[PDB]
Amino acid sequence: PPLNFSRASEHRNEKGERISMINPRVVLDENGISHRSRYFIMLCDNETAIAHAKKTSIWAVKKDSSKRISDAYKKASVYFIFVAQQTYNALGYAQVVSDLNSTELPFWSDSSHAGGVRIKWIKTCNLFSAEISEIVSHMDHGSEARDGMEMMYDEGSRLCTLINYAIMKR
């Protein structure tokens, strides 16, 4: 059954703090973000990039989102969720396990990237899920996700769950 995101900001605890629709024990800020686990989308339009990232566990972070990702990495556990740009196929998800390093940039990066990070793959795949595609398509206030943007806690948690389920559905 798909997760319904309607009325998300009305999920509140006794103190008036926003809480997750998936696990009410998780307290969120008014952007729907958790202080403890944070999620960013990577929209991949380059088959070479994802192939090398799945081989070497190195990713290139874009300049337009590097500052927010680096700040989050110092304060929280940070996860990247990888989605193919042209199909919204899920490609996997990983935890970021090093901060941005301009000297670790992979060969497939370009001048739009600020530095490379090491990641630890949790799941890898290449599968289409309708609900995944819907979450990505509405991630930016009903318009499509921007590459590198931070998503809400419930979007990140649900996407990981959907990837796990899609992999077992094989």
Curated annotation (Swiss-Prot):
Disruption phenotype: Read-through transcription of regulatory lncRNAs (long non-coding RNAs). Decreases premature pre-mRNA 3'-end formation of ssm4. Increases levels and cytoplasmic localization of mating and meiosis specific transcripts during vegetative growth. Decreases heterochromatin formation at meiotic heterochromatin islands. It is found in: Nucleus. Residues 37-163 form the YTH domain. RNA-binding protein that recognizes and binds N6-methyladenosine (m6A)-containing RNAs, a modification present at internal sites of mRNAs and some non-coding RNAs. Functions alone and as part of the erh1-mmi1 complex, to recruit the CCR4-NOT complex and the NURS complex to target RNAs. Suppresses the meiotic program during vegetative growth and promotes the meiotic program during mating. Binds to DSR (determinant of selective removal) regions in meiotic mRNA, and recruits the NURS complex to targets. Component of the erh1-mmi1 complex composed of mmi1 and erh1. Interacts (via N-terminus) with erh1 in a 2:2 stoichiometry. Interacts with rrp6. This is RNA binding exosome specificity factor Mmi1. It comes from Schizosaccharomyces pombe (strain 972 / ATCC 24843) (Fission yeast). The lineage of its organism: Eukaryota, Fungi, Dikarya, Ascomycota, Taphrinomycotina. The chain holds residues 314 to 483 of 488 of the full protein.
